[PDB]
Design an enzyme around this catalytic site. Structure first.
Site, PDB file in Angstrom:
ATOM      1  N   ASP A  69      -0.391  -2.727   8.474  1.00 22.78           N
ATOM      2  CA  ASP A  69      -1.219  -2.576   6.880  1.00 22.78           C
ATOM      3  C   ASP A  69      -0.038  -3.241   6.132  1.00 22.78           C
ATOM      4  O   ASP A  69       1.113  -3.365   6.144  1.00 22.78           O
ATOM      5  CB  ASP A  69      -1.693  -1.254   6.715  1.00 22.78           C
ATOM      6  N   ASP A  77     -10.237  -2.325   2.422  1.00 24.35           N
ATOM      7  CA  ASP A  77     -10.593  -1.034   1.661  1.00 24.35           C
ATOM      8  C   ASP A  77     -12.016  -1.491   1.029  1.00 24.35           C
ATOM      9  O   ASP A  77     -12.247  -1.695  -0.076  1.00 24.35           O
ATOM     10  CB  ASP A  77      -9.592  -0.786   0.544  1.00 24.35           C
TER      11      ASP A  77
HETATM   12  C1  LIG Z   1      -4.950   9.995  -4.241  1.00 26.97           C
HETATM   13  O1  LIG Z   1      -4.201   9.126  -3.291  1.00 26.97           O
HETATM   14  C2  LIG Z   1      -3.105   9.196  -3.283  1.00 26.97           C
HETATM   15  C3  LIG Z   1      -2.562   7.833  -3.934  1.00 26.97           C
HETATM   16  C4  LIG Z   1      -3.770   7.023  -4.290  1.00 26.97           C
HETATM   17  C5  LIG Z   1      -3.407   5.350  -3.704  1.00 26.97           C
HETATM   18  C6  LIG Z   1      -4.910   4.506  -3.697  1.00 26.97           C
HETATM   19  C7  LIG Z   1      -4.510   3.209  -2.912  1.00 26.97           C
HETATM   20  C8  LIG Z   1      -5.561   2.919  -1.728  1.00 26.97           C
HETATM   21  C9  LIG Z   1      -5.462   1.749  -0.998  1.00 26.97           C
HETATM   22  C10 LIG Z   1      -4.491   1.760   0.186  1.00 26.97           C
HETATM   23  N1  LIG Z   1      -5.074   0.964   1.283  1.00 26.97           N
HETATM   24  C11 LIG Z   1      -4.424   1.009   2.462  1.00 26.97           C
HETATM   25  C12 LIG Z   1      -3.299   2.155   2.733  1.00 26.97           C
HETATM   26  C13 LIG Z   1      -3.876   3.370   3.421  1.00 26.97           C
HETATM   27  O2  LIG Z   1      -4.846   4.094   2.251  1.00 26.97           O
HETATM   28  C14 LIG Z   1      -2.869   4.240   3.780  1.00 26.97           C
HETATM   29  O3  LIG Z   1      -2.070   3.508   4.755  1.00 26.97           O
HETATM   30  C15 LIG Z   1      -5.007   2.979   4.511  1.00 26.97           C
HETATM   31  O4  LIG Z   1      -5.705   4.003   4.864  1.00 26.97           O
HETATM   32  C16 LIG Z   1      -6.016   1.757   4.389  1.00 26.97           C
HETATM   33  O5  LIG Z   1      -6.805   1.544   5.351  1.00 26.97           O
HETATM   34  C17 LIG Z   1      -5.290   0.557   3.729  1.00 26.97           C
HETATM   35  O6  LIG Z   1      -6.115  -0.674   3.592  1.00 26.97           O
END
Ligand SMILES: COCCCCCCCCCN[C@H]1C[C@](O)(CO)[C@@H](O)[C@H](O)[C@H]1O
Ligand SMILES: [Ca+2]
Ligand SMILES: [Ca+2]
Lengths: 853, 87
Positions: free
Chosen positions: A451, A527
């Site tokens: 990722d 996402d």
């Molecule tokens: C309250 O939250 C704590 C901090 C907020 C940060 C929000 C940014 C989210 C978007 C991230 N997208 C990723 C990483 C991922 O979220 C983790 O590896 C994967 O699940 C996903 O599939 C991928 O696209």
């Protein structure tokens, strides 16, 4: 919405410069005195009439009816980038011949015809013809632009980020005219419609792998992947254009007897474009596959159902999820571990409290014949106690800045550095890191998710790496950007192969991708959000990827952001059950939505969708083998199967799997029915739930309930199913097959079936596989070999045949080589004209025939 | 000499010959002709489980390669050898 952190074309200085050149008289002209016909190519000098800059055009006819156009500077101050590692081979050429000439033109013939290329000298122009029919023109609108390397066009800032731009303006661009084409498709990834829109009154489509937080629908902003391949379809022909450039690229599309014009504008590199002349869309599929390869054959388990979220909290949680599937009679092949399984987002590690015994967790999952996927991102925490960081730092394998220090940006572990995956030594290091001795706690049933490999840089311009970072060989990041993620994907997949001694097929999901990424595993649309229109858009997004060779595509089931209402989650399971990559996933702050947590009516609908998917695994597997061997997409737009039905050219609420199944999932809350367009003159379609036959072409109003998944089998096809649904695909892969024969109006049908061990390269290295042809005509069903080189030791047998559209026979007779003639019992429903043949009992490896008397 | 007699489906519905009991094909709507195989979608397999409590499992877990019964009798032709663990 906060989009000011992403450049529009006007904020991209090379795009602003290029796009301000409007259609008119090109200043470029070909110096026919410099013309040379060579062993592989025609070379001719071009000149800008005002600046006197000299360029070299390299023109090639290629085997398989394709043309390659490359344009570079005659005397460049320093070399321009040419994209490596994407083409699987040096494309075989065909000989060019001068077959006509005058004062302002030369006519070239590819081999002995029928394809011809007319090079016009002044103004410079190329015309591509089959015999006397004009297929396509190059520079007809005079939009060619080639900024030569000179001694914010130079230093440039955007927001608070500064690009030193040490080489100045170097952008290249070129236009293409497609007479007779009104519909174009491809150039993923965009949250936009399958049929691409004209860009005249707005932004060009942008190709630049970027991490867009909470991306929105129906807009041309660049998302995580970039495949610079455009397909054009008319009632009469199919063509493709493959713009082989790895830099930031913008694409303008305009319509104008009907004609579509395409313009590509790229920040650096050479002009390198393949014209794929069809004439059918399957010819284009083959042409492009010969250049960039085919879909890697997925291990069977990876076509099952994947259960994921951010994050399962510890080993006990993972085992409770595993046991929940069994306690609620729902199949699942893989449980996924997102970034919170590691030690503070140090990849290849395990949290010492919540994942203290990973080998033991993997052993428990193996005892259930299930797999695990662990996430591994390419950003490496700057941490002197982190052995991965220390090795990469000590061996100089990181992307660098211009002053020679290792680049440092911000991501999940805080301050992080970025390995130079364009460096073959770095990729070899990465692949070796997946050995069972180096990746402590991993095991053969642990696969990988890459990722953030755009690469995502939280404090970088547009949330990515600085343009003037420096890579292997001194190339700038602006030169290579769109293949960085592909290199991550490639090196990870090679790691999973190498760790097994070359025996096990890999499984790697990747977020960023480029042309050629189909060789390394699966992709998903990033996402998305738990809303009905995001459910709808999964079809055109995965269709746009399918058309350009990325067949292993999907979207997060349920949506990544927000909490789906139960009816939406049901509909998303039904949608995802009929899409190639089938994974439920969710954001850290969402409620838990494992499918047994819902009320029983929703659970039952979701279980039904899971059962349908697992039963169709032999069908899915064979479609993916055909993709692997031929380059044909698994999930297909209706127009691919009905190229002359103009009412299909824009459809994106329906799709085909192969040529046999048409799917129209329900994608509206409270729906009472759907309108299904069933195409085909003299075609029949069978509702696979009710066996009701329907003639084409028609728009059928089909009432639906919560458990409805509108699916139709085409007359003339045979679909193989495993009707004994078990808890995972490993448990099923020795079970007997049921054949579903859908009779054409002529009483015929045909289909194929591929079988192997389900997970190794033995089908290739030892020809250990079976490819069967099943064919029905007259009143006889015959199984024969579709590839005699394949043999396989297997207990799989034919336990049942279901024939739709058949009358009641007087007797049923089976003949198998090596056995006496046998009589089969049968049941017949006169209402539905469905014939069920009981227990043929014959090995799937044997030739046999069944006769209805 | 006098011959023997056939089997009748527990749900009524049908009557089948004796040699279609446990013949690895589902002939009975309630799954009763296949108590010992994986052939019926609604069948059940009985694990006697001496030394512990007897247990019924789904027919789909007979010879699936996974040890579902402590006595291991659900796995008799799958390549998974289940040790007796009823303690
Ligand atoms: C309250 O939250 C704590 C901090 C907020 C940060 C929000 C940014 C989210 C978007 C991230 N997208 C990723 C990483 C991922 O979220 C983790 O590896 C994967 O699940 C996903 O599939 C991928 O696209
Ligand atoms: Ca039976
Ligand atoms: Ca079992």
């Amino acid at each position: 919405v906060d989009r000011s952190n992403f450049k529009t074309c006007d904020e991209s200085s090379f795009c602003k410069r290029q796009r301000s050149i409007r259609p008119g008289l090109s200043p470029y002209r070909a110096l026919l005195d410099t013309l040379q016909l060579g062993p592989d190519a025609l070379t001719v000098h071009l000149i800008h009439e005002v600046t006197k800059v000299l360029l070299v055009l390299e023109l090639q006819g290629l085997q398989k009816d394709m043309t390659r156009i490359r344009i570079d500077e005659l005397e460049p101050r320093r070399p321009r980038y040419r994209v490596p590692d994407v083409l699987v081979a040096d494309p075989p050429t065909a000989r060019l011949s001068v077959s006509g000439r005058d004062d302002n033109s030369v006519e070239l013939t590819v081999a002995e015809g029928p394809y011809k290329i007319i090079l016009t000298a002044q103004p410079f122009r190329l015309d591509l013809l089959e015999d006397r029919s004009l297929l396509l023109s190059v520079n007809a609108r005079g939009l060619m632009a080639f900024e030569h390397q000179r001694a914010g066009a130079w230093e440039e800032t955007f927001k608070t980020h500064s690009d030193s731009k040490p080489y100045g303006p170097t952008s290249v661009g070129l236009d293409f005219s497609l007479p007779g084409m009104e519909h174009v498709y491809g150039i993923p990834e965009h949250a936009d419609s399958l049929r691409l829109k004209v860009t005249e009154g707005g932004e060009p489509y942008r190709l630049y792998n970027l991490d867009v937080f909470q991306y929105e629908l129906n807009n041309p902003m660049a998302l995580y992947g970039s495949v610079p391949v455009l397909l054009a379809h008319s009632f009469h022909r199919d063509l493709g254009i493959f713009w082989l450039n790895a830099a930031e690229t913008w694409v303008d599309i305009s319509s104008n007897t009907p004609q579509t014009d395409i313009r590509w504008m790229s920040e650096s590199g050479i002009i390198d474009v393949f014209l794929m002349l069809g004439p059918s869309v399957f010819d284009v599929f083959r042409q492009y596959a010969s250049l960039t390869g085919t879909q890697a054959l997925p291990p069977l388990f990876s076509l099952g159902y994947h259960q994921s979220r951010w994050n399962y909290r510890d080993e006990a949680d993972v085992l409770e999820v595993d046991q929940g599937f069994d306690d609620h009679n729902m199949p699942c092949d893989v449980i996924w571990l997102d970034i919170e399984h590691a030690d503070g987002k140090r990849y290849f590690t395990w949290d010492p409290t919540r994942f203290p015994q990973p080998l033991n967790m993997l052993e428990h999952l193996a005892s259930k014949r299930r797999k695990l996927v662990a996430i591994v991102d390419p950003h490496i925490k700057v941490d002197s106690g982190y052995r991965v960081h220390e090795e990469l730092r000590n061996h100089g394998l990181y992307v660098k800045t211009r002053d020679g220090s290792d680049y440092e940006g911000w991501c999940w572990p805080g301050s992080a550095s970025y390995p130079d995956f364009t460096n073959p030594r770095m990729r070899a290091w990465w692949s070796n890191m997946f050995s069972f001795d180096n990746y402590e706690g991993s095991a053969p049933n642990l696969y990988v998710w890459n990722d953030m490999n755009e690469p995502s840089v939280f404090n970088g311009p547009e949330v990515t790496m600085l343009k003037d970072a420096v890579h292997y060989g001194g190339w700038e990041h602006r030169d290579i950007h769109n293949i960085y993620g592909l290199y991550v994907h490639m090196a990870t997949a090679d790691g999973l192969i190498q760790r097994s001694g070359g025996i096990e097929r890999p499984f790697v999901l990747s977020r960023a991708f480029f042309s050629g990424s189909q060789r390394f595993g699966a992709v998903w649309t990033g996402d998305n959000t738990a809303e009905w229109d995001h459910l709808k858009i999964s079809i055109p997004m995965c269709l746009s990827l399918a058309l350009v060779g990325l067949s292993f595509c999907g979207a997060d089931v349920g949506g990544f952001f927000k909490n789906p209402e139960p009816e939406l989650l049901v509909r998303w399971y039904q949608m995802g059950a009929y899409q190639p990559f089938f994974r439920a996933h969710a954001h850290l702050d969402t409620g838990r939505r494992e499918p047994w947590l819902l009320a029983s009516q929703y659970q039952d609908a979701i279980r039904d969708a899971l059962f349908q998917r697992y039963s169709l695994l032999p069908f899915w597997y064979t479609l993916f083998y055909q993709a692997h061997k031929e380059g044909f997409p698994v999930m297909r737009p209706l127009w691919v199967q009905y190229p002359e039905d103009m009412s299909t050219f824009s459809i994106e609420d329906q799709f085909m799997l192969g040529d046999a199944l048409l799917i129209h999932p329900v994608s509206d809350a409270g729906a009472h029915g759907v309108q299904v367009y069933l195409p085909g003159q003299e075609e029949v379609w069978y509702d696979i739930q009710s066996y009701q036959k329907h003639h084409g072409p028609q728009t059928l109003y089909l009432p639906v309930t919560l458990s409805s998944i509108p699916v139709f089998q085409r007359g003339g096809t045979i679909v193989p199913r495993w009707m004994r649904v078990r808890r995972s695909s490993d448990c099923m892969k020795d079970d007997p097959i049921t054949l579903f024969v859908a009779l054409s109006p002529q009483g015929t049908a045909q289909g194929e079936l591929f079988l192997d061990d389900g997970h190794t390269f033995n089908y290739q290295t030892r020809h250990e596989f079976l490819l069967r042809r099943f064919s029905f005509s007259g009143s006889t069903l015959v199984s024969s070999s579709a590839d005699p080189k394949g043999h396989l030791e297997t207990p799989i047998w034919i336990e049942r045949v279901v024939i739709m559209g058949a009358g009641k026979p007087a007797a049923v007779v089976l003949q198998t080589k090596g056995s006496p003639e046998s009589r089969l019992s049968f049941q017949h429903d006169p209402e539905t004209s469905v014939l069920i043949l009981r227990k043929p009992g014959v090995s799937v490896a044997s030739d046999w025939s069944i006769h209805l008397r | 000499y006098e011959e023997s007699k056939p089997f009748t489906c527990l749900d009524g519905t049908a009557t089948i010959p004796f040699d279609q009991v446990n013949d690895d094909y589902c002939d009975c709507k309630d799954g009763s002709d296949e108590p010992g195989t994986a052939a019926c979608p609604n069948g059940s397999f009985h694990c006697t489980n001496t030394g512990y409590k007897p247990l019924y499992i789904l027919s789909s877990r007979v010879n699936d390669g996974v040890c579902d019964c402590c006595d291991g009798t659900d796995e008799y032709n799958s390549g998974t050898v289940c040790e007796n663990t009823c303690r």
